[PDB]
Amino acid sequence: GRFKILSLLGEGTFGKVVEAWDRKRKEYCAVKIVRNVPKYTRDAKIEIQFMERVRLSDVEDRFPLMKIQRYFQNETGHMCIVMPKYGPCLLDWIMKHGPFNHRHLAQIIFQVGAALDYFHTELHLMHTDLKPENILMESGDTSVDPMTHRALPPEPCRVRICDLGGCCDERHSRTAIVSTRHYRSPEVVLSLGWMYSTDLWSMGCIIYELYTGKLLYDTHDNLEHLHLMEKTLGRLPADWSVRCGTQEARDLFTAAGTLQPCKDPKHIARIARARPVREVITEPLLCDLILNLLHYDRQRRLNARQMMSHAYVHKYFPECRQHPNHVDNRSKLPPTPVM
Ligand SMILES: */C(=C\C(=O)N1CCCC[C@@H](n2c(NC(=O)c3ccnc(C)c3)nc3cccc(C)c32)C1)CN(C)C
Secondary structure (H helix, E strand, C coil): CCCEEEEEEEEEEEEEEEEEEEEECCCEEEEEEEECCHHHHHHHHHHHHHHHHHHHHHHCCCCECCCCCEEEEEECCCCEECCCCCCEHHHHHHHHHCCCHHHHHHHHHHHHHHHHHHHCCCCCCECCCCCCEEEECCCCCEEECCCCCEEEEECCCCCCCCCCCCCCCCCCCCCCCCHHHCCCCCHHHHHHHCCCCCHHHHHHHHHHHHHHCCEEEECHHHHHHHHHHHHHCCCCCCCHHHHHCCHHHHCECCCCCCCCCCCCCCHHHHHCCCCCCCHCCHHHHHHHHHHHHCCCCCCCCCHHHHHHHHHHHHHHHHHHHCCCHHHHHHCCCCCCCCC
């Protein structure tokens, strides 16, 4: 009727993202076509609801969050979310062109930070499912570095945070399980209590992957995940065995309170095969940024404002300080979250 399908941009379990022509509004768009199934149709209606709350408040698109244009339920019942056409996810870039250089990484960290502190302290929502697959480049345009001849992203490297289906609020289920496991914080795994700070754990795992091209935790099992945290970051806190909130979580510890060892030969090999982030990240400011996003203490862990205001971003993205989203170029902001 109004939207004519032009391209297939991507496909998955959720459904499809297509490029479409808006006949009444005279432009190209991306349309998310959700599979016409009761659980996804309702999670689309919930996902839609978080999307109108972002635009209606940020009416002049100050933060790099996705901005819905329109939506409808098709004549075949598929939920259809009309949005601007953005580019490919960060995962697509790192796999074709490799990791970003310090400047574009700093620019990416700045933008996601600005969006996340707006999410956390202005809307009081958590994303809970941030991953390189749903951080999209604003544009798919490419430039060539004259010295290295390698591909450079647009300057600045604008990105957009997507996939608001899993957004949570300030009294989500306390033992609720959030995040894709690769980017799932330990507080969620063992049900110790989680809030905004779990989005910052995911940023730590994403920033590691954007810089190394490798997942920090390529794991499918809670206990192997926890040993990898121990080998990449240091000992798990001693009190953790008394505070887990579900039976499943506490049975990963001794009667004494230490981690039970894995002996699946696949998990013994992988932990032996992981090396500490501190030896992989040679840049000391980038290392400190990643390590304190992966802090076991949810309150000493960096918040979104500290991440975007980190010394690493100030060194490699110095024009950070002339951006209208820089903290000192804004009025006094709501207080940052406590954990
Ligand atoms: C990377 C996944 C990825 O790049 N995308 C996730 C959804 C699939 C389509 C893809 N894509 C878009 N999408 C959008 O503009 C858009 C806007 C709003 N919401 C969504 C969900 C998507 N536009 C594109 C232009 C060029 C290339 C691509 C791929 C593209 C975004 C993971 N890899 C597929 C492995």
